[PDB]
Amino acid sequence: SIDETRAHLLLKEKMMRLGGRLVLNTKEELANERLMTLKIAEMKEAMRTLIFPPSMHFFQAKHLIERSQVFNILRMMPKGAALHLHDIGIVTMDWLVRNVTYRPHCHICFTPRGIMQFRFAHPTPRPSEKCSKWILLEDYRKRVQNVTEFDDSLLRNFTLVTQHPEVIYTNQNVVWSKFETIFFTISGLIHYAPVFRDYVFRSMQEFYEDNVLYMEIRARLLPVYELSGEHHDEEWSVKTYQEVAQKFVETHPEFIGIKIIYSDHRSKDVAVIAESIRMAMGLRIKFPTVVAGFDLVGHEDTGHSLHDYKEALMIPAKDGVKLPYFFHAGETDWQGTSIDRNILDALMLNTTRIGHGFALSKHPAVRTYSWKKDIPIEVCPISNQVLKLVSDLRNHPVATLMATGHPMVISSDDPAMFGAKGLSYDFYEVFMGIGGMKADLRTLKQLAMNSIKYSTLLESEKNTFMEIWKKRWDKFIADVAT
Amino acid sequence: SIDETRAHLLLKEKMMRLGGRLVLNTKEELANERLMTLKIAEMKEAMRTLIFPPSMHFFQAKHLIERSQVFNILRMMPKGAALHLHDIGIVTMDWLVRNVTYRPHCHICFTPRGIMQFRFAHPTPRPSEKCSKWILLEDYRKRVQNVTEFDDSLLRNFTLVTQHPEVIYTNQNVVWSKFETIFFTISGLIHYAPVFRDYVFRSMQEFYEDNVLYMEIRARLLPVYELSGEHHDEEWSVKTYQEVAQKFVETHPEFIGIKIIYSDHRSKDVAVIAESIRMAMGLRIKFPTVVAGFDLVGHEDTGHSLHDYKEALMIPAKDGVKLPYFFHAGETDWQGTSIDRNILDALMLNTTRIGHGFALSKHPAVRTYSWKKDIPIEVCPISNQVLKLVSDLRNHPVATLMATGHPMVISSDDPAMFGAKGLSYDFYEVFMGIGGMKADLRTLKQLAMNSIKYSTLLESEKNTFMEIWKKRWDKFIADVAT
Ligand SMILES: *[C@@H]1O[C@H](CO)[C@@H](O)[C@H](O)[C@H]1NC(C)=O
Ligand SMILES: *[C@@H]1O[C@H](CO)[C@@H](O)[C@H](O)[C@H]1NC(C)=O
Ligand SMILES: *[C@@H]1O[C@H](CO)[C@@H](O)[C@H](O)[C@H]1NC(C)=O
Ligand SMILES: *[C@@H]1O[C@H](CO)[C@@H](O)[C@H](O)[C@H]1NC(C)=O
Ligand SMILES: *[C@@H]1O[C@H](CO)[C@@H](O)[C@H](O)[C@H]1NC(C)=O
Ligand SMILES: *[C@H]1O[C@H](CO)[C@@H](O)[C@H](O)[C@H]1NC(C)=O
Ligand SMILES: [Zn+2]
Ligand SMILES: [Zn+2]
């Protein structure tokens, strides 16, 4: 009878963890048995040596994750949708260097502070205040002793990846300062119109290859420029995303496409943000099928709170309009402060999803409210480790939320800046590190289905997506089972 | 109405966090205002610079914590009782060096592998297999060219404290190896009878000075020895603890005293532990007023599970007797394994308190069960940081438990090994790091009161303890408010 009490507590936990109540068919039971055999063996070996990739910094863990048989299976898994991604962090940086900086008219410069920047131009742009002289990359490479090393030095400027990140990034402000500097550096490359088109297309190629069929992207929609010196506007960029995504779907018929969440930086004044909000409303009118809504991005600890922006964020409501929100909220180690209260405020503003919600488990009333309104968190484990929110992912606060089956989706945020690609590395971190040893095929299946459920697609489009994914899921299962 | 919802959610979180329903009188309201003002000021500054002691390693944080005005108030607070302590980690190591190692008849020696060892003896003992030459400290001392340097060498060998603990202790097995080696090395100093008596007395002096009035100690009851080489038994050490505590209470009449939880090491075979369990039952008959029960200690990740010991641990029930248990359980980063299942098994064995329960928040059925049977966890935050379970204490899993007011007590475990003293450093980590910015005077008062409630004292003794504590509390409140 105590023996029965113990059995009951274990079964209750089995049923309440994420995916616990899902029914597997006989072929799925076999796939589960095989995947769990490999997962348990990897875990046993990690317990012996303490070489456990989720407990190490991703920069040093990556090469080990790539050798994991569990990682190999996760790679093959149709993961559904990537719902939390930013515009310029979703394409492997190698291609920016090896392909893009080798294109005609590419110039490089270094600021007074010494920050690398790029510009496509003809003729050579004239010295400005941010650039003493621009140098044609073709000319520069004629003058360097070892081109291979020069190119690699460019690649090092384009990602946070480093040996000894504990020495290099001593605190969260330093890592954010480096992060932001990267966006500044690569921006002149990506926002040149022919590169912009090629970039958007390649990001779809990379996710498709990783068995991801739908992307929603937080996009700043900064001006895209031509050689002629002309700059385009926000509407042009949204049209271009739609056009490139339509082109990709033509040759990739199971790919669903992309939607855009227009975003602006949370360092900005409330009047400026009010203008972004009006722009968001207008963009929703012009492209109801492409623009999902609005979000505020940037370093959450040091920028403005959602409360600070109350008057701007209430505009759509004061005008009788629904503007969907996807707020980044609670991406912080602090508790009981104005920063983690952003989660409550995002919910009061009827957010559709919460970006990160890392602080959520410390707020049990907010957690309940979120659970009751079925508003998921978007969890990006690698991002949280790299930007120093938690050191060992076995301590990630989402573990507690996985154990009670809270609504969530997994995504990768800015994988290219961390040396990741698509969604698979992030799925490995959740499946192996955050969900513990008893996370199983039902966990994975639930996370994949959730990413379809919590997308902003029409219900009729979700049904179609679900049908496409179920067939991909069946082929995956067959492969793993045999 | 949306404004009202927001207010309700915050009020609910206010009422359900630990201590949230406690009613403060007007003098306590004033004390809380002053304490929270200083706490908010310290946190605001930490947020500006990111120099935040709970987020840093305690070895590097301590000098800043000692400068904190909040720490100064906590040192003054009557904290009630220390309920999770080990026998040889509770006296500042400085005294073991400056005082004990200068006592007549103290020898030092080195094992074949080079591990330092001590023995008090007269005359000098013969060379043995574990020691090839015992050398008197007085002899050894003049031979060195700087005796102040040799002394400091000893002090550095008696604690884990170091610069660059990330470099020195690269994993949990390494820190545990050094940890246990310290216990081996100091053991010969402390188990000589006159020192053993003096050690126990000084441990009470240190906690008393820190405004702690009662202690329960996990004690291995290792043989205590005389100059002649004679060894005493378990019964003798229990009688000695009772006698020394009685002596202390005689001149410190507000001090409640001590009790002993007999413990044995979890690396041992099940039959050997069955012998310890019979010993525990016998000690309980002989000393029902002094011996509270039994616990299993040692590195939990690498030793036997409670399940493995089921046969031994059921002996009292099979013999018709209640042996109270106080199990260390779930002191681990792993999840879904046999290690974190120790919490469930502790509870199935009717444990009175859980040591650590670090993994508890990841087990919601187990968490509910322990809440329903009112079984508390004993939280030792500095221990968990130093032994590498979590790097930033803002991420400590007990934060989630504090937010729902889960039953718990704070203790210090082995403060001497970490460079701590008494209970105040652990109370600072809980109040500033784990409980967040909103933890307040009610948080502190509840935890102090909890440590009386969850002690093993008779209800009539808890009543008397509460009366003594309340007088010290009122004086503390008057000081802080003025
Ligand atoms: C970035 O590139 C510059 C130019 O070659 C080089 O000086 C520097 O080492 C690179 N930065 C990093 C962090 O590798
Ligand atoms: C660069 O990439 C584009 C497609 O984005 C394509 O024109 C070409 O294959 C690449 N160039 C080279 C030299 O590989
Ligand atoms: C959220 O929904 C409520 C109920 O319809 C409404 O009163 C409020 O205006 C909405 N808020 C926003 C910011 O859209
Ligand atoms: C104490 O000295 C030993 C043996 O020389 C050394 O290896 C060990 O790391 C030291 N332990 C400490 C400083 O805790
Ligand atoms: C715990 O209590 C139950 C029910 O009274 C009893 O059956 C069991 O033997 C007890 N276990 C121990 C270890 O005392
Ligand atoms: C240290 O040892 C005891 C305390 O246990 C004390 O009575 C004695 O005075 C001290 N010895 C010295 C040399 O200060
Ligand atoms: Zn993001
Ligand atoms: Zn302990």
Side-chain angles (χ1 to χ4, degrees), chain A residues 138-180:
Chain A
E138 256 162 71
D139 294 336
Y140 203 109
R141 287 185 174 111
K142 296 191 171 207
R143 305 172 215 148
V144 304
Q145 228 92 332
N146 179 352
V147 179
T148 293
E149 175 54 25
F150 172 72
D151 285 356
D152 294 354
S153 85
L154 299 190
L155 190 55
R156 294 188 324 254
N157 282 261
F158 289 10
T159 81
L160 296 167
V161 175
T162 185
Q163 283 177 215
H164 310 296
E166 76 284 350
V167 176
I168 308 310
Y169 314 119
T170 52
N171 66 55
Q172 283 163 210
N173 284 351
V174 177
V175 76
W176 267 92
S177 171
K178 298 289 171 176
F179 200 35
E180 287 159 329

Side-chain angles (χ1 to χ4, degrees), chain B residues 14-33:
Chain B
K14 192 189 202 298
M15 295 306 102
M16 61 187 161
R17 67 174 78 96
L18 201 138
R21 286 183 168 173
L22 288 180
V23 178
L24 261 37
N25 61 50
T26 77
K27 211 113 98 185
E28 290 169 323
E29 289 283 0
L30 208 289
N32 183 245
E33 284 212 348

Side-chain angles (χ1 to χ4, degrees), chain A residues 295-321 323-359:
Chain A
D295 183 11
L296 290 163
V297 300
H299 194 16
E300 194 182 347
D301 281 359
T302 56
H304 279 105
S305 69
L306 297 180
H307 191 80
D308 289 347
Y309 287 132
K310 199 176 86 205
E311 302 308 330
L313 301 174
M314 289 300 297
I315 288 167
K318 291 176 300 203
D319 297 11
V321 163
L323 173 65
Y325 291 135
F326 302 85
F327 295 122
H328 278 68
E331 194 195 350
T332 185
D333 290 320
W334 300 110
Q335 176 186 185
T337 71
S338 68
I339 309 146
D340 51 306
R341 264 179 317 267
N342 286 323
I343 305 173
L344 169 63
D345 281 334
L347 257 8
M348 295 307 89
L349 293 164
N350 315 329
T351 197
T352 304
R353 302 188 308 263
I354 300 156
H356 305 283
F358 182 95

Side-chain angles (χ1 to χ4, degrees), chain A residues 193-321 323-339:
Chain A
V195 174
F196 185 70
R197 287 177 210 113
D198 280 350
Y199 183 97
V200 174
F201 196 89
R202 200 181 169 93
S203 75
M204 282 172 306
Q205 279 175 301
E206 274 168 31
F207 280 74
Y208 183 77
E209 196 273 339
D210 198 43
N211 208 348
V212 180
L213 302 180
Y214 176 67
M215 299 152 76
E216 294 180 351
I217 306 171
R218 266 77 159 185
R220 295 286 309 278
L221 304 171
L222 302 175
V224 172
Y225 70 93
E226 305 281 349
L227 268 192
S228 66
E230 139 165 71
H231 287 225
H232 302 286
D233 66 5
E234 292 84 358
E235 173 185 351
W236 187 94
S237 281
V238 179
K239 190 57 78 105
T240 301
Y241 273 116
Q242 184 183 31
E243 286 169 358
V244 175
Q246 278 155 6
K247 182 88 165 183
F248 192 85
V249 170
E250 283 179 4
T251 50
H252 301 84
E254 300 171 72
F255 197 82
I256 309 294
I258 67 187
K259 293 204 200 307
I260 298 308
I261 298 163
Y262 174 48
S263 65
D264 204 355
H265 202 269
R266 67 192 314 125
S267 63
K268 294 201 197 306
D269 294 312
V270 45
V272 171
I273 297 307
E275 185 175 70
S276 300
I277 292 290
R278 291 178 154 86
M279 175 67 69
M281 287 185 287
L283 252 13
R284 280 223 92 203
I285 306 293
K286 282 197 236 291
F287 306 91
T289 227
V290 187
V291 178
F294 184 77
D295 183 11
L296 290 163
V297 300
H299 194 16
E300 194 182 347
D301 281 359
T302 56
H304 279 105
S305 69
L306 297 180
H307 191 80
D308 289 347
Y309 287 132
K310 199 176 86 205
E311 302 308 330
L313 301 174
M314 289 300 297
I315 288 167
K318 291 176 300 203
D319 297 11
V321 163
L323 173 65
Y325 291 135
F326 302 85
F327 295 122
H328 278 68
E331 194 195 350
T332 185
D333 290 320
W334 300 110
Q335 176 186 185
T337 71
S338 68
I339 309 146

